[PDB]
Design a protein around this ligand. Structure first.
Ligand code: HEM
Ligand code: HEM
Ligand code: HEM
Ligand code: HEM
Ligand code: HEM
Ligand code: FES
Lengths: 105, 67, 241, 75, 51, 60, 378, 147, 108, 48
């Protein structure tokens, strides 16, 4: 979430200071629109992770209703964000690429 | 000679400055085309304009006047 | 004449968000009917039984009708000869045939005024600005003379004298006479044909102003009253270890 | 489908509640409204405006364009 | 994403459905005919000639 | 007081559900005619443009 | 047990409004919906009561109209009023469309296409329904859309006959559409409960955009009371424009009695029907105009098909939002465009506005989507 | 069974014995002497039938197409040189053109000064588009069917 | 899976007409029901189409009636006809009442 | 109506034209007479 990505992923950082996500402290991965692949993707998610994304999500709802945001300090640390799913997810990308693959076969 | 901002203030009101300017451009064109022969233009634009001011102040007075 | 006078705003006595009028000009509007206006005019949807409560009294309205020839229905009689007319009798406008208009002036459909304000376009000034704006053609133009000179108008040329200026002289209660209370009584008895509750309904709007101001807060309160707890909630993420 | 109880899985979390009559309807009401209010609004403004700008520029603009275009000239 | 159904497999699938496809298509067409009896086509119809 | 308004007028009023309601309509009267009246006053001070006419109409 | 749980019709009910679990994060995007139905109900309600007096007869047109207006006390109010209220329904209509849009709610197809049925349905259902007044505006304009009935190759002549009832618009139409109105509202209704159950199936989205199972409450109290609120807001709206300046939105050509020979200068659609007729006159060909027309909403269907981004909420997608309010600019833009009669600047103006509609949606919005994706990098 | 049922239901919208009749009901005699512009009442509007003169035809043929307010070459309206059939309502604000009047050997609108040439064609006044031409076929020599 | 099983609107449908398990012993007492609805539908249907022409206006009463009758081809048929059909609906109506009665179906 | 019934296109035609229409007005309200059309109905008796 840093200057190129604070301009660009600073649509998610400076301009999600504007578009909100990361300054809202969101989870990058969490932003993926729910899809089936996304669905079972999460089904396979890691546990401690699952809790984490949970608290994140709920909180997001919380301030959302509150229509407030955390301290800009509390606003999320830029860059410095594990790509949570992306190993798991992207793995699934290969999966549905595989079901998709022999499927093509 | 009933009180007639129509007539009455049309003296008083239409003495207006801007009104007079439109009168300048006005009779100006009046003679302008007037000189011409075999021409289609009646130059209504001015008459319209002067009227527009005449009203502009007019109801801004006449009603307040009129009873 | 294709160049629209944006009719100036005559501070119409009703021109306020709520504001009122006088009538018997409309009687002289009826006498504009009887003379000026509805000689050539229809209000035709106009119905006398309406104005009953408006201006004249039970008798004054009564005779006001009876003062007119009904041209009654037939008694065995088809044909249908004349009567005095009732309150139930409407406001019996002019010459019947559409060609009676076409001839009346040359062509010149003399339309009904019933909605005319609310019908044609523009406001009281359409009477004041436009109609009272009967005026000489400036130049460069000649009608068939069928159109008189009314410069303020669609063609700037037709149709009308100021029977004020050349007085058919009536103020029954007495005054010098002007166009409004029969013009805006042709707007009123157009609105008194449309928005007489422009008074009555006006009244209700008042209470509305309060109801919301009361309820709207009370409502919003109630909403907060509900949602409040949810507002402040504390939910703990305390993952074990 | 939904309803509850088949709903979803939540492990190791916690809550806190309060009865309604407890609170005050409008703590810091005017106060909190605030550049909090301007925080949402003002936050969005830049994102918002430009099109509307073009608008006023337009109805104004073309308003002039055709409006003047209705004027008559000599010869 | 036509590649999804684009493959000699689904290609073969089409190769199967093809004649049937002709069939149901004909069904629709003739339906338009008799239903409509639209003059445009109706003309060519001998002894279905109605006059 | 106001504590018996909030309270007793809960208790001796808003407590019993019915009582709360009977209270409600009980108002519906007073409010109704009243706002009717003062409202009429508003319109009254608004104009005096007609129906005061009778005296001027010389109220035969 | 709890009858709330127990009673079968109720079992629907609780399942419908009452017991309904719903996303807690829920946003004001809501209100309009119940409004519309309330509107709709009132619509029917008034129309009904309206119907109660009103006659829709050829000689009676302005005639009964007076009887329904000049006679009719509060037929004044109810009439002109809830007439305006129709337009209000349109207001929340286009609004609501926006709701899905910046929502991007397009995720749920049967809902989307549903409200598409709601779309063209609302459109003509009005139009016919609307025209019923048969007023000079709606009259020469009746010659207008009446001339819309003729479009097709080889058909329209016979069609705009069959539509028109024959050689022109007529009392034929009068009955025809008159009924057509009488029917269509019902259609809207059943359509409604339809799309409704469809909704209850999936549940539905959230302004947040996250899976809602995290947080839900029943509409009662929350969405319930909130709804009550927005309703009061409505009566403010309707009961306002009504209550204060009823005629404000009107076009005088209405009160103008239909004068068969008239054909006056204006010929415009309602603030409701507005943005169309511009779009109509825009192109120089028949089915260009129409296919465009149905291609605006239909276009929106494609937009669900055109859905691109890896994230639902444009909230996180600012450049998208630029395309959003920007697209709106193209929209009310299209309004004021129609807001002029045929004019030199306008020609080009709308001429480009269409491209926008095709770009600002079909291209520039989708192109935008792709772009934002590229930027996303996650 | 369904075919007739459905096609009866659909027919009931298409036309009417009543509306039909009157729709195309119109014939004309050959009494219209070159010169006079008769006038018929067809479909609730004015149906003008003008028998014309070599002089007429000749001149009307020689108007310039390029400069007309509503460009439309005489020769494409009338199906027969000699005869011109029109609808009798002024395309301005709807009065009725006056047969052979006004500055153009056509008709005259006594409402705003709207001049029509012999064809229909607008040649003076606000009038927008030229007087409109009905559909009709000439039957035998003495018969003309409007509509 | 089986869309018949699967499709939600269908899920109603199969649950309604199609997948509907129903007493095998079932008796002719039935028929009238769908009839009525068919009737009803036709009722509406015709009325609708009827409405389509018909006007219900004061001067038009017999007047439009003629236009709806004397004019109306098959307005003859549809009109007078499905008019009778109404009565038929009544027929199965009282009938049907009987159905419950000798049925004694009053249980529900 | 009876057009197709009994008389012929002409026979019906004259059959009408054989009757005085009492035409509508031409400028004329009043409304003097014509021969009447097939479109003309079957013009029954004394009005009142
Ligand atoms: C106070 C009485 C009258 C009032 C308020 C009145 C007002 C009006 C108004 C508002 C219009 C329509 C303006 C428009 O189309 O925008 C009109 C049209 C007209 N009235 Fe009057 N008028 C009155 C008396 C007359 C009289 C005495 C005559 C006979 C000279 C007359 C003959 C006409 C005609 C011919 C038109 C049609 C104008 C045109 O379209 O060329 N009216 N009048
Ligand atoms: C089935 C319930 C409805 C009935 C019975 C109904 C009946 C009527 C009738 C009889 C009129 C003519 C009288 C008048 O104009 O005041 C009318 C006008 C209209 N109503 Fe409806 N309608 C209904 C539902 C709707 C709906 C769903 C809409 C769409 C929001 C709608 C919008 C209109 C419009 C646009 C007009 C004409 C404009 C005007 O008020 O002058 N109404 N309706
Ligand atoms: C007859 C007019 C309509 C009615 C009465 C109606 C009713 C509703 C109701 C009651 C909701 C509940 C939740 C909410 O409002 O957000 C809703 C949501 C929705 N409607 Fe409509 N609607 C109508 C027109 C539309 C239109 C025109 C569309 C789009 C073409 C649409 C697509 C949706 C969608 C996608 C949702 C889900 C919203 C979300 O969860 O964010 N409906 N509607
Ligand atoms: C609007 C007219 C009605 C319609 C459309 C209607 C529709 C139906 C339908 C579709 C059935 C399915 C099974 C069957 O027909 O036996 C049914 C059964 C039944 N109906 Fe009706 N019905 C109507 C009037 C009545 C009336 C008037 C009654 C008695 C007051 C009635 C009481 C019943 C009962 C008790 C059954 C159960 C029959 C059994 O299983 O033996 N319904 N109806
Ligand atoms: C909502 C759909 C319906 C519409 C639009 C409708 C409308 C009409 C209209 C306009 C008439 C007068 C024209 C005529 O008599 O031919 C009529 C007659 C009637 N219809 Fe309906 N109606 C409908 C449903 C029904 C229903 C449910 C029944 C009850 C079976 C019904 C039974 C009748 C009867 C008894 C008459 C009068 C008798 C007659 O045909 O002369 N119709 N209807
Ligand atoms: S009606 Fe023909 S010039 Fe006005």
């Amino acid at each position: 979430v840093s200057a190129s990505s604070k301009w660009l992923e600073g649509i998610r950082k400076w301009y999600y200071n504007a578009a909100g996500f990361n300054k809202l402290g969101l989870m990058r991965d969490d932003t993926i629109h729910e899809n089936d692949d996304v669905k079972e993707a999460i089904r396979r998610l890691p546990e401690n992770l699952y809790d984490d994304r949970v608290f994140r999500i709920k909180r997001a709802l919380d301030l959302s209703m509150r229509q407030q945001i955390l301290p800009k300090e509390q606003w999320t640390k830029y860059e410095e964000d594990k790509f949570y799913l992306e190993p798991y997810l992207k793995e699934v990308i290969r999966e549905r690429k595989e079901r998709e693959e022999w499927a093509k076969k | 000679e009933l009180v007639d901002p129509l007539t009455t203030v049309r003296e008083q009101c239409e003495q207006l400055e801007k009104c007079v300017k439109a009168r300048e451009r006005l009779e100006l064109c009046d003679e302008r085309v007037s000189s011409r022969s075999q021409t289609e233009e009646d130059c209504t634009e001015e008459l319209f304009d002067f009227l527009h001011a005449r009203d502009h102040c007019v109801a801004h007075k006449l009603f307040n006047s009129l009873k | 004449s294709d160049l629209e006078l944006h009719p100036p705003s005559y501070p119409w006595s009703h021109r306020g968000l709520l504001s009122s009028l006088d009538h018997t000009s409309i009687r002289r509007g009826f006498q504009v009917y009887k003379q000026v206006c509805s000689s050539c005019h229809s209000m035709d949807y106009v119905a006398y039984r309406h104005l009953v409560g408006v201006c004249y009294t039970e008798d004054e309205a009564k005779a006001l009708a009876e003062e007119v020839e009904v041209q009654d229905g037939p008694n065995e009689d088809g044909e249908m000869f004349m009567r005095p007319g009732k309150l139930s009798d409407y406001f019996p406008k002019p010459y019947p045939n559409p060609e009676a208009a076409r001839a009346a002036n040359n062509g010149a459909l003399p339309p009904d005024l019933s909605y005319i304000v609310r019908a044609r376009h523009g406001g009281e000034d359409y009477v004041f600005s436009l109609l009272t704006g009967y005026c000489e053609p400036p130049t460069g133009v000649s009608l068939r003379e069928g159109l008189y000179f009314n410069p303020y108008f669609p063609g700037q040329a037709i149709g009308m004298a100021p029977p004020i200026y050349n007085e058919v002289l009536e103020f029954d209660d007495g005054t010098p006479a002007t166009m409004s209370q029969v013009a805006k009584d042709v707007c009123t008895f157009l609105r008194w044909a449309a928005e007489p509750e422009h008074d009555h309904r006006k009244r209700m709007g008042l209470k509305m102003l309060l109801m919301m101001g009361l309820l709207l807060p009370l409502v919003y309160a109630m909403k907060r009253h509900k949602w409040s707890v949810l507002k402040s909630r504390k939910l703990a993420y305390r993952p074990p270890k | 489908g939904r309803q509850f109880g088949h709903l979803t899985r939540v492990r190791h979390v916690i809550t806190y509640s309060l009865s309604p009559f407890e609170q005050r309807a409008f703590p810091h009401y005017f106060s909190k409204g605030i550049p909090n209010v301007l925080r949402r609004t003002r936050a969005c403004i830049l994102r918002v405006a430009p099109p509307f700008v073009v608008f006023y520029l337009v109805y104004t603009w073309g308003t002039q364009e055709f409006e003047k275009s209705k004027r008559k000239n000599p010869a | 994403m036509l590649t999804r159904f684009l493959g000699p497999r689904y290609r073969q699938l089409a190769r199967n459905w093809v004649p049937t496809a002709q069939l149901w298509g004909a069904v629709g067409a003739v339906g338009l005919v008799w239903a409509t009896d639209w003059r445009l086509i109706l003309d060519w119809v001998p002894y279905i000639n109605g006059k | 007081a106001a504590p018996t308004l909030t309270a007793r007028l809960y208790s001796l009023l808003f407590r019993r559900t019915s009582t709360f309601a009977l209270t409600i309509v009980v108002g519906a009267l007073f409010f109704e005619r009243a706002f009717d009246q003062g409202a009429d006053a508003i319109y009254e001070h608004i104009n005096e443009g007609k129906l005061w006419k009778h005296i001027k109409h010389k109220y035969e | 047990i709890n009858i709330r749980k127990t009673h079968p019709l109720m079992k629907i009910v609780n399942n419908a409004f009452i017991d309904l679990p719903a996303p807690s994060n829920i946003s004001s995007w809501w209100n309009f919906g119940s409004l519309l139905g309330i509107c709709l109900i009132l619509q029917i309600l008034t129309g009904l009561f309206l119907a109660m007096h009103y006659t829709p007869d050829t000689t009676t047109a302005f005639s009964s109209v007076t009887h329904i207006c000049r006679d009719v006390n509060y037929g004044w109010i109810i009439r002109y009023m809830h007439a305006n209220g129709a337009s209000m329904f349109f207001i929340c209509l286009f609004m609501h469309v926006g709701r899905g849009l910046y929502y991007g709610s397009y995720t749920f197809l049967e809902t989307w296409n549903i409200g598409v049925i709601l779309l063209f349905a609302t459109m003509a259902t009005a139009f016919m329904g609307y025209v019923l007044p048969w007023g000079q505006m709606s009259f020469w304009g009746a010659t207008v859309i009446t001339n819309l009935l003729s479009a097709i190759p080889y058909i329209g002549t016979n069609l705009v006959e069959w539509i028109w009832g024959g050689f022109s618009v007529d009392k034929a139409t009068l009955t025809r559409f008159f009924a057509f109105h009488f029917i269509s509202p019902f259609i809207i209704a059943a359509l409604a409960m339809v799309h409704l159950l469809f909704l209850h199936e999936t549940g539905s989205n959230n302004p947040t955009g996250i899976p809602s199972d995290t947080d839900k409450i029943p509409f009662h109290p929350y969405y319930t009371i909130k709804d009550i609120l927005g309703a009061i807001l409505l009566i403010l709206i309707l009961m306002l424009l009504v209550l204060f300046t009823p005629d404000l939105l009107g076009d005088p050509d209405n009160y103008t009695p239909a004068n068969p020979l008239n054909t006056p200068p204006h010929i415009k659609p309602e603030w409701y029907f507005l943005f169309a007729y511009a779009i109509l006159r825009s192109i120089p060909n028949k089915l260009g105009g129409v296919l465009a027309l149905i291609l605006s909403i239909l276009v929106l269907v494609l937009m669900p098909l055109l859905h691109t981004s890896k994230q639902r909420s444009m909230m996180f997608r600012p450049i998208s939002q630029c395309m959003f309010w920007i697209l709106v600019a193209d929209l009310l833009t299209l309004t004021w465009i129609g807001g002029q009669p045929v004019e030199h600047p306008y020609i080009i103006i709308g001429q480009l506005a269409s491209i926008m509609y095709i770009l600002l949606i079909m291209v520039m919005m989708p192109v935008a989507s792709i772009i934002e994706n590229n930027l996303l990098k996650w | 069974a369904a075919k007739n049922v459905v096609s009866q239901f659909v027919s009931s919208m298409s036309a009417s014995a009543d509306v039909l009749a009157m729709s195309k009901i119109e014939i004309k005699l050959s009494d219209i002497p070159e010169g006079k512009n008769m006038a018929f009442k067809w479909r609730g509007k004015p149906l003008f039938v003008r028998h014309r003169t070599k002089k007429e035809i000749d001149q009307e043929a020689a108007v310039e197409v390029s400069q007309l307010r509503d460009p439309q070459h005489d020769l494409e309206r009338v199906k027969k040189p000699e005869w011109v059939i029109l609808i009798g309502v002024c395309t301005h604000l709807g009065c009725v053109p006056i047969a052979n009047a006004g500055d153009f050997g056509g008709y005259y609108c006594p409402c705003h000064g709207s001049h029509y040439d012999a064809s229909g064609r607008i040649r003076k006044g606000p009038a927008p588009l030229n007087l409109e031409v009905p559909s009709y076929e000439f039957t035998s020599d003495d018969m003309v069917i409007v509509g």
